[PDB]
């Protein structure tokens, strides 16, 4: 017959708490709008969003 | 004028390991979205 797999009995969930926000809205809604010639870049890491 | 007796050994292959392959489990082990497309063929695993 066809194969089978043992069904899981629980669920493991691990995350790092106490992390600051990324604040992408504060970067997108900035009053300093650049141009395609001098486009800007900001990297978001180790944050929640 | 004088003789002795010599012994020799020889092996001939007769049997072989009976290998069975589960085609459905080999292709779409634990994924239903995979089986939904593997059943669109079916006959490949059947003939295997
Ligand atoms: C825009 O970005 C600059 C540079 O970080 C910052 O000084 C300024 O407060 C920002 N303005 C707004 C409205 O977020």
Swiss-Prot record, chain B:
Annotated glycosylation sites: 2
Annotated function: Mediates fusion of the virion and cellular membranes by acting as a class I viral fusion protein. Under the current model, the protein has at least three conformational states: pre-fusion native state, pre-hairpin intermediate state, and post-fusion hairpin state. During viral and target cell membrane fusion, the coiled coil regions (heptad repeats) assume a trimer-of-hairpins structure, positioning the fusion peptide in close proximity to the C-terminal region of the ectodomain.
Protein name: Spike protein S2
